[PDB]
Each structure stands twice: as structure tokens, then as C-alpha cells.
Structure 1
Amino acid sequence: LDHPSPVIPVDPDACILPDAALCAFTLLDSVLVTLVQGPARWKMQLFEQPCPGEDPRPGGQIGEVELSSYTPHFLPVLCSVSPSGSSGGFTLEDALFGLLFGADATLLQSPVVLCGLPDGQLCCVILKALVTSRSAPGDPNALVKILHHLEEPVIFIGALKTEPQEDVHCDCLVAFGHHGRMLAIKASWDESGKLVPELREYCLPGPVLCAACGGGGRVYHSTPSDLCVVDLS
């Protein structure tokens, strides 16, 4: 960022993984998660990222799988979700974390990655579990799982601290469509003394065109008319 007219070309030096076929990527700690276009089957890749101040390297790929669910303008999006104790993502409250993904994920304190995709399909993947080799391929059905299918492309995921009573322990998982089926998710633990996830699929105005999360259960979203806001608190 120091980087020794105020215009600057990059040199192709600063290039790393010229995979070329890659749409979308995120970061964790020391980890890089890409999402690579191919023929029909999109596969998710995963690389090390060097924790020491070094030459800013990729490393070797740990992990690839096929989003078998996914078979082709709208750039899919990915998200990081780490549970409490274990950074450019979202921590849940352990109740929810446990409810969505389950025990494996909770036990391993696995940061988990959610891919929404142009269809609207919202798939999560467990990064402890994505380590593979030539002799050891990703199974799709193991490893990537599919939460809810909005039937329109996905703009935005987050998590929300409803019940407001820097690392905030959210309780409620937020998705958006484009035409505006939004999807909030919460913990219930109701009526069976048993954990069930409160789903709704509300059905908002407009094409929706970007979203965000801000202090205390308030989403700030666009229509093409006006900048609109929601409460969940």
C-alpha cells in the first residue's frame, strides 16, 4: 500500500495465480479462497497464503471441489463465517453456528464459507474439511452443502445481531436476491425444547443492487429508485 502523475500501472510482477478462469474470491487469516469458472462445473479452489512477511505468495492448492449443484454478468459471492474463540468475515453465536452447519463445524471451530451463485443457490463449505490431493479428490456431496435456494441471483450475505441487549457475536444470517426475496435466518429452540431455525423469505421491493450491515440489526440496501433501510431488531 506504501508503493514507492498520481496514476500507476501495475506491472505483471504483482500478478500471483494468473488462473484467469476465476470469478470470485475472499480472504481469511493466512488462507485464500477462490471460486473458479470452468465448463459447466464450477469448482472451489483454496490456496495457502504466506503468514510471514515474505514475497506475497499463493503457495500450493490444498483444496478443490465441484459445486455439482452449479451448472450455467452476475458474479457469484462467497462468505467467511468463524464461530466464537477462533480477519475479513462474520462470527455467529455458537447456537446458530451449531444449528446451520452442525457439530463437525462447531467442534473443529472450522471457519465456513458460503457461496451464493447466479441461480440464487447459497452453498456453505467447511475449510477444515477441504484438504485433498491427486490421490484424494474432493467429493462434492461431502463437503459443499446447500442451505436455501432463492430463485434469483444473490447480491449480499451477512449476519445480524438482533436482540441488542468490534467482534460482535451475531444471531441471524442475512441473504438477498436481486428482484428482492431477502432471507433472514435465526435460532428458535421452540416448542419441542429443540433447536429449529426460524426461516422467513420476505419479498421486498425493487431490483436490489447492493446491500450492507450497520450498527444493530439494520441493513442499508439500494433500489434503483432510492437508498432504503430495514430493521430486524
Structure 2
Amino acid sequence: LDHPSPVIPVDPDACILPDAALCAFTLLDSVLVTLVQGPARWKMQLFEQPCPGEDPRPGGQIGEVELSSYTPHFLPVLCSVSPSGSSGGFTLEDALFGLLFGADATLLQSPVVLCGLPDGQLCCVILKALVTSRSAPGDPNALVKILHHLEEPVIFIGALKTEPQEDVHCDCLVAFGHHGRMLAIKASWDESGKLVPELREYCLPGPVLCAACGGGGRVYHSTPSDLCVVDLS
């Protein structure tokens, strides 16, 4: 951003990993999870990213996978969901973390990556579990799993502090369809002395166009008519 007419064209010297088929990508602390359209089956990749201020490099690919469920305008979306105790993403709270990603993720204290795809279904992949090689190829049916099948494309995934009563230990999971199926999840531990998941498929109006998250369970979304707002708090 220092970067020693006010317009400045970029020279291809600045290009890093020109994979030229990559549809979406996100970042965590020291890692650069990307997601690249191959042929029919889309494949997630995972790179290093050198922590010291050097030539800004990717490094050599730690891992890949194949999102076997996806067989194709709408780019997919990625979200990091690290837990508390372990970053551009969202940190969940431990009870929820444990409900959704299980003991493995809890114990390794592993970030998790939620990919919503234009297909609709929204799959998660554990990073620590995603280390592979040419002698050790990443097994899809084991390594990538699928929370929920929205019927419709996916626009936004987030997390919210309901019960507010930067590092906020969110409690709520939000997904959002193009056509306006919102879906929220939260942890209960109700009724049997057992942890249970709270599903809600709400149904807002409209084609939704964008979404964000504001202090305390409010979700600013934008139908084609006007900037609307929803509260879960």
C-alpha cells in the first residue's frame, strides 16, 4: 500500500501464483486458502505464505482436495471460522465450534473453512487435516463435509453475537441464499441434557444482493428495492 496521472497500472512482476483457473480465495494468518475451478470437479488448495517480510510469495502447496459434490457467473465464497484460543475471519465460541466441527477440530484447535458454492450446498474442511502430497493424496469423502444443502446459490456466510448481554466470540452462524433463504444456527444443549443444533431456515423476501454483519446480531442485507435489516439479537 505504500507503493513508492493518479492511475498506476500493475506490471506482471506483481503476479503470484498465476493459476488462471482460481475462482475464489481467502486468507488466514500464515496460510492462503484458494479454490480453483478445474474441469467439472472443483478443487480446493491451500498454500503457505511466508510470515517474514520477504518477496511476497505463496510457497509450495501444502494440500489440495476435490469437492466431489460440485459438478457445474456466481463466484463461490469462503469463510474462516477459527476457534477461541487459536486473521481476517470469524472466531466462534467453543460450544458451537464443538457442535459443528466435532472433537477433531476442537482438539487440534484447527481453523475450519466453510465454502459456499454456487451449487448451494455449503461444505466445510478442516485445515490441520488437510495436508497431502503426491505420496499422500487428499481423500475427499473423508476430508470435506457438508453442513447444509440450501437449494439456491450462496451469497454470504457470517457469524453473530446474539445475547450481547474486535475478537468477539460469536455464537451464531448465518448463511444467505440468493433468493432469500437465510439460515441460522446456534447451540442449545436443551431438553435431554445434550448439545443440539438450532436450525432455522428463515425466508426473507427478494433476491438478496449482498450482506454484512453489524454489532449484535443485526444483519444488513440489500434486496433490489432497498437496504433492509434483520435482527437476531
Deviation at 1:83, TM superposition (A): 0.6
Calculate percent identity across the aligned residue pairs. Answer: 100
Question: What SS does structure 2 have at the residue aligned with 1:155?
Answer: strand
Q: 1-side partners of 2:69 and 2:126: how far apart?
A: 16
Q: Is there any run of 5+ residues in structure 1 with no aligned partner, and where?
A: none
CA distance in 1, matches of 2:79, 2:109: 16
Q: Per-residue displacement from partner, 1:47-82 (whole Å, max 9, x unpaired)?
A: 100000000000000000000011110000011001
Deviation at 1:38, TM superposition (A): 1.1
SS in 1 for 2:228: strand
Aligned to 2:170: 170
Q: Give the 4+ runs in structure 1 shifted more than 3 A.
A: none
SS of aligned partner of 1:32: coil
Give the drift of 1:90: 0.4
Would you say how many aligned residue pairs link Structure 1 and Structure 2? 233
Question: Is 1:77–2:77 an aligned residue pair?
Answer: yes
Give the drift of 1:170.
0.6
Higher strand share: 1
Q: Provide TM-score, normalisation by structure 2.
A: 0.99
Does the residue aligned with 1:200 lie in a helix, a strand or coil?
A: strand
Task: Give the C-alpha shift of residue 29 in structure 1.
Answer: 0.6
Q: Distance in 2 between matches of 1:82 and 1:179?
A: 29
Counterpart-to-counterpart distance in 2, 1:161 and 1:141: 33
For structure 2, which runs of at least 5 residues remain unmatched after alignment? none
CA distance in 1, matches of 2:150, 2:214: 23
Normalization by structure 1: what TM-score? 0.99
> C-alpha distance in 1, partners of 2:221/2:214?
11
Write the distance in 2 (CA, Å) between the matches of 1:85 and 1:188. 22
Deviation at 1:231, TM superposition (A): 0.2
- Following superposition, the deviation at residue 35 of structure 1 comes to 0.4
In 2, the alpha carbon distance for the partners of 1:60 and 1:77 equals: 23
Alpha-carbon distance in structure 1 between the residues aligned to 2:15 and 2:163: 45
Partner of 2:111: 111
Instruction: Render the CA deviation track for 1:148-194: whole Å, top value 9, x for unaligned.
Output: 01010100000111011110001110000000000000001011100
Distance 2:46 2:71 in 1: 20
Cα RMSD of the aligned pairs, angstroms, is 0.5
1-side partners of 2:124 and 2:40: how far apart? Answer: 19
How far apart in 1 are the matches of 2:188 and 2:71? 34
Once the two structures are TM-superposed, the CA of residue 142 in structure 1 deviates from its matched residue by 1.2
Q: CA deviation at 1:141?
A: 1.2
